[PDB]
Write a protein that binds this DNA or RNA. Structure first.
Length: 1093
DNA sequence: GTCAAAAGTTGCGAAGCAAC
């Protein structure tokens, strides 16, 4: 079969043969249904170039009566030129092989019998053919691979994952908190070796259109396509389509010996015709294209498995959710596109980015940051217009072309739109391509339609709409429209009248908006002006939306989902800050914030921090050095952060802002040190930025004083700015030269020796490593520690207990799964080493890996909720195989063999379950529930709704919230841990693993002497803890359901969901309600106790 | 120990350790 297709490849298609064995024929087979149209083609490049030569030929090739109308004259011309470039890449590959065969006589040794086709660096030899005294590439395989490379080169960058600080930390091996400014930026734009080859190889294999032999070693089924990809990347480096940069980590800190390769694809002109249709090759080669836009009723297919978790199938309910979201039609909002176009890329960067950089009128590290910002915006802008260019081809009126987006379920249950820059992920794109739309009657400002319009405009303009009633926000909005924004509104009225903008459009927008500036704010100015010049106000069509947005969503979800003790009055008061109102029929968040409690969860946490800080000050009331250090940290923060304020007489004011990120990531399992690093980071960014201000402050007046050049605005007078500068220098000095240390359970100050001082140079000023670390230690002990105490005090110690038990159970289970998998692999390999047809380098077959995974099912690797599936340990790492998979023909680009297998979970269990059974379950329900809202854009913890359906959609969202609050993630974990506990055998664990388990199940002093029996006993203890927690959560949810509740967690609109519970708890204090609820709790405890018969 | 996906390069010589 396959031999008939590739009859001339070198070697025998029999793993038993004694001579050269061809592992390409042994590893792959032809599918029972064609996947690639090039299979059988003698000259794929020639044949595909032919297909791309005219619309008529493309239609014949793809056996379709119609071709994407974007495939026009100019596009066809570009693809003809791109095909000629494919011949160049093909030519470079041919010379590289010849060079490889000539070097150290590999070709001669291979012809003589040496099995070089089994070397990790010679796997490509499996796709060559004898040619006279040498070997040559099989043209069909080589040319198809090139076609894969061309498509990859055109769209890979638009499908790369975004890299955050943590990612860069993992890659570079540098502490996330001590990363040098710009590093994350440099790494987020380029691709690591693994990233590049992996995506390239995946693409090559799909284009070869064959199927893997389940009984063939991974060293070939995966290694040959990877070997081909490595060569193609090498070819692209020679052609300059890709730039390789090897970043030496030692340059940043001499201990780090890692040299990391980065690959950046050369960008095509933003105006290149190819951008309007960058997927012609993919749609021509594949019978079922992956990359393509979905227009009209061309709908994306539904993914069968969870993203990057092959072993996890999307449940029926998750698939229904994905189908529902992919069904939604998005439409281009022409006015906004025209606005972006008129402004221009240069002015959008100036308005929403860093504008033009004068890399000498701003601090070096600041500039690196600004440059990072412009990039994100510029890339979003080019991406939107590439899409617009293809949409415009679909018809005369671009605003009528329906667009669909593909989604998939992530590891944590979130429905993620696929692609780097889309409406769900990119703010700029979000205001140009929308699914929201409504025709409103705005002829009378007393209409319900006009109220909705106002709500959308207000929210977009940064008015806190969920903190006040509709009537009150209407007045706030009116004030802004008739005041500060008035000049911008006039400019937009003129734009919507003549289509022209002033030369100072950026300045008018900037001044009018102030800190309200955002893309959605531009949409509000755009839409309000359009209504003003509107002909028929009785039927105003607008995509303006209102986002029903969760109020402290993650933290509140965790509180409802994992608090398992009796009800307390503090919890009742705090949970109300998240929209769960007890005994207050039809109460909304708007009313709550304006009449009952103006502090949300962030503020309450901050207020707890303040109290915990005072407590810390007392414990060291006599220690002047300690007090002075605390004063310096607050002084430094008050100097650059807006959320920290210090009055004239010393009064400390802390705004909810400082607790936002910290509370959020604390619910995602973050440690205290990470929070400290981020807090320091925001401080330093402000400093670097202040330095830049000086540079220009002095360029304007070479006589301006340093004090006034650095604090000239933030102060009242000169002697006043002079004392601000005194605070700065002193603070930086004490915070970098002295750090707090935990000795004997007490705080003691230590000299670092690496103090910071000297005449500052606002051009090169840079807080070094040791100094950022000193700053971090001070931040940790004098600010983050008490913040953590306040947070715990706010969300409840019961919740913290649950999350720790959850973390322990899932870590323990992940450690076992990881170790057992590794062991079964070593056992199998040892067994293969006795097989003569097998060789080291080859690995296990896919079937063998499958068997090993299956042997772990009794340890319950998956957590099931009944509508979602979570696999916490699931991952892909190079540690299982611990070997190279393939290299390029120059012996470089050595791609490690990565394998899908369980790995230690760390704290991931908390985020997985919180995010998954919280917002993830809620959105899933909202997409599939009876009367599920249509035409919305869901963004995990918020949903954009069209102005015509804000009331019902918001109510449905709140009902969806209530539905997810019926979940019990701890019970789900318990049922998994329970099966695991009865089948596990800790004795079969490596000492390395057993130790990790002891850290989770025993208290630090019991680890050293801990016997298998000891940890095994402790592990079973955790199981009982989980059972008891699950039982309480379950009871609480049933009890709460009997009471009258009003839920408005997805706030803004003021349409709370009523559970209509019968037990009336109105006219009762939180203490009274807690007592009544606990009575119901105890009642059920007895009922579900002895009587369930 | 923040989730969303992983994660160093290269000579010698043909695996996998040494040097950076």
């Amino acid at each position: 079969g396959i031999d008939a297709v590739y009859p001339s490849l070198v070697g025998t298609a029999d793993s038993k043969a004694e001579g050269i064995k061809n592992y390409f024929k042994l590893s792959f087979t032809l599918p029972e249904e064609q996947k690639s149209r090039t299979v059988g083609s003698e000259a794929p490049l020639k044949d595909v170039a032919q297909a791309l030569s005219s619309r008529a030929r493309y239609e014949l090739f793809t056996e379709k009566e119609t071709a994407n109308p974007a495939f026009n004259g100019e596009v066809i011309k570009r693809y003809k030129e791109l095909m000629e470039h494919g011949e160049g890449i093909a030519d470079i590959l041919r010379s590289r092989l010849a060079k490889f065969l000539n070097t150290k006589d590999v070709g001669k040794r291979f012809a003589q019998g040496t099995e070089a086709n089994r070397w990790v660096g010679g796997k490509l030899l499996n796709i060559v053919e004898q040619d006279g005294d040498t070997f040559k590439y099989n043209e069909q395989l080589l040319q198809t691979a090139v076609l894969a490379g061309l498509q990859w080169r055109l769209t890979a960058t638009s499908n790369t994952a975004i890299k955050d600080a943590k990612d860069v930390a993992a890659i570079t091996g540098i502490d996330q908190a001590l990363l040098p400014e710009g590093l994350v930026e440099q790494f987020d734009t380029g691709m690591t070796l693994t990233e590049a080859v992996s995506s390239l190889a995946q693409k090559i294999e799909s284009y070869w259109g064959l199927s893997r032999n389940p009984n063939a070693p991974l060293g070939y089924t995966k290694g040959i396509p990877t070997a081909m990809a490595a060569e193609i990347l090498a070819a692209f480096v020679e052609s300059t389509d890709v730039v390789e940069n090897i970043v030496d980590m030692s340059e940043i800190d001499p201990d780090n010996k890692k040299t990391i390769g980065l690959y950046t694809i050369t960008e095509l002109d933003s105006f290149d015709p190819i951008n309007s249709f960058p997927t012609a090759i993919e749609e021509a080669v594949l019978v079922n294209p992956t990359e393509k836009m979905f227009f009209g009723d061309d709908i994306p297919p539904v993914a069968n498995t969870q993203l990057r978790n092959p072993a996890v199938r999307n449940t029926p309910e998750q698939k229904a959710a994905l189908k529902a979201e992919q069904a939604t039609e998005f439409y281009v909002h022409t006015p906004m596109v025209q606005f972006y176009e008129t402004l221009g890329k240069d002015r959008i960067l100036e308005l929403m980015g860093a504008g033009t950089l004068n890399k000498e009128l701003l601090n070096d590290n600041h500039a690196k940051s600004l440059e990072g910002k412009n990039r994100s915006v510029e890339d979003s802008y080019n991406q939107l217009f590439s899409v617009i260019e293809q949409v415009r081809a679909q018809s005369e009126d671009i605003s009528t072309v329906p667009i669909h987006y593909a989604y998939n379920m992530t590891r944590v249950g979130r429905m993620q739109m696929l692609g780097k820059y889309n409406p769900q992920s990119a703010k700029l794109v979000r205001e140009a391509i929308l699914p929201t739309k409504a025709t409103l009657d705005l002829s009378n400002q007393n209409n319900e339609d006009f109220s909705a319009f106002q709500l959308g405009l207000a929210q977009a303009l940064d008015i806190k709409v969920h903190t006040m009633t509709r009537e009150v926000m209407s007045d706030e909005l009116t004030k802004l429209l008739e005041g500060n924004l008035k000049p911008a509104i006039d400019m937009m009225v003129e734009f919507n009248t003549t289509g022209s903008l002033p030369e100072n459009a950026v300045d008018v927008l900037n001044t009018a908006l102030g800190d309200r500036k955002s893309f959605v704010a531009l949409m509000a100015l755009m839409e309000y002006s359009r209504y003003l010049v509107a002909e028929d106000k009785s039927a105003f069509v607008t995509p303006l939306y209102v986002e029903a947005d969760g109020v402290t969503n993650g933290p509140i979800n965790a509180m409802m989902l994992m608090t398992g003790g009796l009800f307390t009055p503090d919890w009742i008061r705090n949970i109300a800050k998240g929209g769960l109102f007890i005994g207050s029929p039809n109460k909304t968040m708007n009313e709550h914030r304006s009449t009952a409690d103006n502090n949300d969860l962030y503020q309450a946490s901050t207020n707890a921090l303040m109290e915990s800080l005072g407590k810390l000050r007392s414990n060291y009331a006599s220690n002047m050095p300690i007090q002075s250090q605390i004063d310096s940290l607050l002084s430094l923060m008050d100097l650059f952060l807006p959320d920290i304020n210090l009055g004239e007489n010393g009064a400390l004011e802390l705004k909810r802002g400082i607790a936002k990120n910290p509370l959020t990531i604390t619910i995602y399992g973050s440690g205290a040190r990470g929070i400290a690093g981020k807090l320091v980071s925001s401080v330093t960014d402000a400093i670097y930025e202040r330095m830049s201000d000086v540079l220009k402050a002095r360029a304007k007046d070479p006589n301006i004083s340093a004090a006034m050049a650095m604090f000239g605005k933030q102060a009242a007078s000169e002697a006043h700015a002079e004392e601000l500068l005194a605070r700065f220098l002193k603070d930086m000095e004490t915070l970098t030269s002295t750090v707090p240390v935990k000795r004997k359970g007490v705080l003691e100050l230590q000299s670092t020796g690496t103090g910071a001082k000297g005449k500052i140079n606002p051009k090169t000023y840079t807080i070094k490593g040791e100094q950022l670390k000193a700053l971090q230690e001070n931040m940790l002990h004098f600010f983050v520690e008490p913040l953590r105490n306040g947070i715990t005090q706010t969300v409840g110690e019961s919740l913290v207990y649950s999350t720790e038990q959850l973390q322990k159970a899932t870590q323990i289970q992940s450690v076992v799964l990881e170790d057992m998998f590794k062991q079964r692999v070593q056992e199998k390999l040892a067994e293969k080493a006795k097989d003569p047809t097998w060789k080291k380098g080859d690995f296990l077959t896919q079937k063998e890996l499958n068997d090993i995974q299956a042997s772990l099912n009794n340890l319950a690797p998956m957590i099931e909720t009944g509508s979602q599936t979570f696999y916490i340990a699931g991952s892909e790492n190079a540690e299982v195989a611990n070997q190279v998979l393939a290299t390029n023909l120059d012996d470089r680009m050595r791609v490690p063999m990565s394998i899908y297998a369980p790995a230690q979970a760390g704290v991931a269990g908390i985020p997985f379950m919180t995010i998954g059974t919280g917002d993830g379950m809620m959105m899933q329900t909202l997409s599939t529930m009876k009367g599920a809202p249509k035409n919305t854009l869901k963004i995990f913890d918020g949903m954009n709704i069209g102005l015509n359906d804000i009331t019902d959609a918001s109510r449905k969202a709140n009902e969806a919230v209530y539905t997810s609050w019926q979940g019990n993630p701890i019970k789900n974990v318990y049922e998994s841990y329970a099966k695991f506990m009865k089948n596990v055998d800790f004795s079969k664990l490596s000492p390395e693993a057993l130790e990790a388990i002891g850290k989770s199940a025993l208290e630090y002093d019991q680890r050293e002497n801990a016997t298998v029996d000891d940890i095994a006993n402790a592990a079973s203890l955790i199981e009982r803890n989980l059972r008891n927690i699950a039982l309480g959560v379950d009871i609480r949810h049933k009890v709460l359901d009997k009471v009258n509740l009003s839920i408005d967690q997805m706030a803004a609109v003021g349409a709370p969901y009523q559970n209509n519970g019968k037990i009336d708890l109105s006219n009762m204090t939180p203490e009274q309600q807690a007592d009544e609820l606990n009575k119901l709790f105890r009642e059920e405890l007895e009922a579900r106790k002895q009587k369930v018969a």
